[model samples]
Target chain A: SQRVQFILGTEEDEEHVPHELFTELDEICMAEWKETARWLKFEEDVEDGGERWSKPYVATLSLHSLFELRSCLINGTVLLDMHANSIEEISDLILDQQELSSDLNDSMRVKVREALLKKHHHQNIPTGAEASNVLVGEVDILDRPIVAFVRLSPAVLLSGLTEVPIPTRFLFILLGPVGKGQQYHEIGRSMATIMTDEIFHDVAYKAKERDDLLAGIDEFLDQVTVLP
Target chain B: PSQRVQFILGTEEDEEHVPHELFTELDEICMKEGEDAEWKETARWLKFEEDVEDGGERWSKPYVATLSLHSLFELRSCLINGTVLLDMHANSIEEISDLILDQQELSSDLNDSMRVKVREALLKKHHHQNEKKVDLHFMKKIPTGAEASNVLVGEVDILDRPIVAFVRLSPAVLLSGLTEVPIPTRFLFILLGPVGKGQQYHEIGRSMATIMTDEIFHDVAYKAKERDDLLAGIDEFLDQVTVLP
Candidate 1:
């Protein structure tokens, strides 16, 4: 059976869980994976129409990496690639010519990196969109048996999807339910690993938490509860 | 032989004395017996009047004469009425002669007396002038009509009868070049006897000297402050000139 894996981003776990839970888990995870897995991969689409559409490259990580990238983006960092490649590969992408430098302590960087990596590889059985549309067909009493069997299956496919795209390069961790009617959990093992590995880290963390809370929300589907 | 020849002796009867008024009138004219006496008496009177006028040309010979006459008259009056009238002529003649002669010689001593008086007066005047001339000069230089109005003006004779005339006639001789001329006519007239009687002229002169000195002192004291304030005001005024190039 092929199981589809949704990779979480850094922003996901930080968004879903309280700081106490995320921070504790992030501290333990940083101790486990500080040096071996502290590198990020940025994927770019190929321009020429070919079987191979995407290529991945290693991104640098450091204490100042995130801050330096933020500043570079704000001021505009220009990337000069001497290697020949498709123009589409370079589209909608920027790279900083300057090296990253920061004063953040190693421990803090490790913790942040671990939290980010955990968010990069989170997964769930039903995507929020697919689960929301589960009531489209006419109800049949006999269909309940197949539906319950499908829900109990060890590997359930999220429609035809194979994986979820992480939100950004500096994010990791994804939050979602354990099952159809469960609470959210952090999937990343460490902050340093997530930060150096994930894409769409901030958005992935945020969306995972959102989807988890919205899971099994069909109970209040008709009733509108307004919060002031 | 002298006793037989001089048997008849003459009686010493008293001579008939002239009346006081007649003697006084005779004393005025007859030159043989009263010439020296009359001149001396008239000179004494003139000296009195001059002394009364000048208060001693600050002390000239004539002023000395006048003061001597005054002293003589006072002494004689005291002796005659107070004690000499009780003495017999034989006993008092020599003493009276001595007193009279001493006083008479006072007129002759007028040279040294006048010298001493003039010296003293000059010394006093010079001292006062030294102390007060600067102020006087300042007042003279910057006379306010306010002060001029307060000054009294009159004839020199009426002001200081004796001194002014003498000063006017012989300023060089008496004042000895302390002033180029007698006082300025206007200042003289103003400071004259119109102010008061007796010592008034001297008093006023001294007072004016003092007032002028004080005024000068006040001016000097205020000069620096006034200058600073004036300069500051001028600077402010200049600063207000927006049209300046």
Candidate 2:
């Protein structure tokens, strides 16, 4: 069992904060989260059905397995409003449903960066169709639990890009073993509701004077590994 | 309901740390509070008042808490999709009623000060205007009973649990678009992630409030220099809090 050590966020990194599940800064945490967000960056050059997406189209869904139900799997759907149009405050982009009011009226981008730290190989991996909206439940990621199949629509169907905000809805789905009953699916349902706690809801605004929008997310390295 | 709210006198400003502070004294506070006992689903800091009859203690210190957004909602109904309704700028009567009423009981001066804040929040004036309110709640992860038997705090410390706070933006950085603000100084409710614990009287509910108020604006601060006296207040508090059983 690997213990997660927080090394950044504050100006002081590698400072062992020996208390609580001490949290980190948004950009670095956000940067690290893009590890899994890789699945959702939505291919810029994706085709009607070419190998445009990953081998397992549902790679995002495949991630549901690596997530630890207990470890902080912070699910977020933030509205990215550029504060005062300042690029420097990019780290503090305005977050949504948590910060600005619907009545306040502002332009924004919707983004998601979900981090899955552990993989439990407790059971065989499930098929994509069999797993589709079912709870991945709390499965230990077993080696046999291979990501067999996956499918998802591009978050932003790029007819093109421009001055306007991109149409993006953050989504992550994990596929695990089948025919065992719907137990895993039930826990997955609980995972869905963890996003809106007042904590981390409007997290970015808490950053600084501004927040930069996440762009060219596809440029982030796509990588994951099995620990020793 | 048995959450024992405690404070510490500090060598630092009005008061403050996030996880670092947590590692420091807060870790000490939590490290000791539940010692020689079981930590119930407890230790939530709920209120801050001005000038109470001093049980004679000073300001500063710690614990763990799930900053509950749901808990705040338990008290608030004007929320739609979690955004406060009616006046996005004004204070709701319900919002101030419980905290203000409670503080009034704690100290009339504290109540008056809170009332002054309420009128400011209501008029959308004073420090409240530029003041950022954390629209979030802290949800502590400290579970108990069977769940308790499996968790770990320190190496040997067993079965454990779960906390933020608060203050004002410096006038120097308040209205400006300055981003390099000292964390403890400018960001409070923001750091605590919105819905303040103890449902503090809107924004000023955190100990960062203490540092912002205590060190930044102090009676002792105005007093003659007692560099020797400074450490005594904080040192005594730590001594009392960190002693091993």
Candidate 3:
């Protein structure tokens, strides 16, 4: 439970997002997210081709936010440290090649198209193509930290998927601080991860305990945003 | 302005250094060798735009500078020997991204560094050469023993599907006496050190890639995992997150 007043993307100590949103997010985490923990493992699932479960649609939840802050503990020059706001900004550079595209912003739809174009050039991007690329990802429209998870299942837009592929009805938790800047928007996204992470949720059964997690997350975020 | 040791006006020292006549001959040979003055690479690289700092406070217009396709390759090859693949399966996160890449694989496509480079190249190509339909992939078709050092002739692709990755070194460098030119970058610091400290992981990754690929500086890196040091390095790199911004 990491909580902060203002999101790192915006100015510091700016807004006090409502605590109720955190409550709703906490409730979701304890129930649904705990069920999906296996998929979120960093070591990754042992991909089984001979296995017998029918995944009409394979779901991947791309985690961003507090996790990203974890990657920034080092100090050095990534002169081109451009935190992309729109899709066009990151059409070429991929920060996380394996990140899930569900609930992506509009520009992300365009990015997926470009990705599919490139994916065809080499290998299958969304591998088991029974129900190919469907652009689903959240888009934050409201304020007071309106974190969105847009559930989309866009149709495949490529030539040689003559071969294969892979949804989400997403959540847009308006709990954290929201503004312009990749960092803050991403932090809101980090908070969203807890909602679906039942592993942590299993033990964080109490609302107050869940709130405690949000506060920890907020605390972590607050530290990195002031980086030199 | 005093000299440490000055030579006498007419000492009996018969000069055994490289001769001027030989140098002149070499220069003429170099100028006349590959006289393909009209040949050129059909592509170009525009400078990365709005490349400011960590989402820097100031907002300025974008800038795109062009570099020779030849120069881009120069950068590509300089970073060739700088990459050592991280063990694909390391238990800890630090071990996962350990950066003691001293044994630069001068010629291999099994790692992230060169793959990233060629990807960037193809992306630039994709941006400009719309008709080619570029594809970049690494099928580990190795050329070892003698063939590993062959002077490369760019990727020969089918539907831009890069089946085999190959890099051609300049014939003039080994056989001829031309000078080697290095690419300029912000991360080309010292060879070995208390690295990973105050360093961004990716930047360390890039610099490590560049250094290990270095010609004169290749032997400095240990190539194996300097675990404890690198662990602390990654520690410094990833610590103090959350609200510290």
Candidate 4:
């Protein structure tokens, strides 16, 4: 085993760099995905845009697999054009959904609430024009994944004393096993990144049903690159 | 000629040796540089923001001065393809220009006719004149002894691809207020590529200028022992590049 020094860390420290099993899985699954974006019109724009936040997200779908992004979408709860008063209400509504309840136990729900609140409290949440609508995290309880997607109708004002309560139009929740924290974090980043995307955001904001959201993922998958 | 350019650019399979443990200082430099408005403005120019798709909506992006991964990769390719002259002692831009072209003579990428043409363009009076004058209001206050990274880019019909050279002067050249920044010119980058690739060359040049302004990369460029050292600087930058939506 080769002990590699951290790429950006100090000299005295050393960390074992694990092979990304998810990326390997991504290639095995790439026999089908490689052709997804090749014929798309935006290939030039995508290449010209250079390195993007969403390109390397294939590594996060380790246990779930890249082909299973659709599975993650199908298995989880998705809300289109919803209206919520606060973050707490949004969390409860998402946790209470029939889809999420199938996989998450009662105690796991409570634990998730705690973690979400803690994240909301300590994190430097942005507001105003800089605010982000996506809220996602992984909890310790579930071995399987519980993903949730919500699009606010009028874009509710979030309650945070800091940054003057920014408006949020979307909510994305990804809760998985404790050990997969980093993996879940990257997936959340992918969701957050895609929501900022102009085409995807417009499609998601107006999505009529679950299938539309699935179409949104399909559109997103077309932009995803499987590593060479 | 395409083959030579492609070789210099390198395929995805060609692995680069990146220096470990340069990120901490790079982060420190970024934090300090972020607070300075004037410096940030120069960074905007280096990013070629005017050409970006959402250039008007740039304020909506996370950081104002984020380097594009493509730009960094292009710069890396340019550096790998070009020559690096560390501790080069030259007073005038003329002498520096001569040194750069002399290095270009060694590369098989350029034909002899193209080499002469590149030399002619670099030494043209317009080239020196462009550097000699600027709006006082546009000039930013540069620290003493700090170096300026200047870019020169154009086309040579005799050439099929680009030829590049990066030189660092030991004692900075006081070009008499030629640069947008008031600092003495310490580093110069020259590029001459074939026709129809003007935008690509400009992008590469902007990327080069941006790397020079970077805090940790500036230090690295100043003290680089070899071309590989400068490349290591680019690798460190790529490791931390954040992609804007």
DockQ of 4: 0.04
Per-candidate TM-score, first chain only?
Answer: 0.18, 0.23, 0.22, 0.60
Give the 10-residue window scoring lowest on summed lDDT in candidate 2 chain A: A212-221
Report the lDDT tens digits of candidate 3 across residue range A66-185. Answer: 454233211101112233333333332332333323334555445344432332211122232221111112223322222222211222222332222111112222222223433543
- CAPRI-wise, candidate 3 is incorrect
| Ten-residue stretch with the least lDDT total in model 2 chain B | B144-153
Number of clashing pairs, model 2? 50
Scored against the true structure, residue A34 in model 1 reaches a CA lDDT of 17
Output the better candidate (2/4) by lDDT.
Answer: 4
Model 4 lDDT on a 0 to 1 scale = 0.49
Per-residue lDDT over B15-125 for candidate 1, one digit per residue giving the tens place of the 0 to 100 score: 221101000000011112222211111111111111111421231233311011122222223222221111112222233223322344333433444334322222221
RMSD of each: 53.8, 24.8, 26.0, 18.5
10 residues in a row with least lDDT, candidate 1 chain B: B19-28
Give the per-residue lDDT of model 1 (tens digit) for A39-143: 222322223432343454432222122222223223332222112122122221211112211322344334333332332111222132111001001111111
Q: Could you give the interface RMSD of each candidate, to one decimal?
A: 51.6, 20.5, 16.0, 9.7
Model 4 chain A: weakest 10-residue lDDT segment is: A21-30
lDDT of 4 by residue, A1-228 (tens): 011111112223222111111000000010110101100111111133323222422122221233344566687787766677777777788877876676777777777766555423221122223234434434556667667777666666666512235455555566666566545544544554455455555555455677766676665554432210
DockQ of 2: 0.01
Give the higher-TM-score candidate: 1 or 4.
4
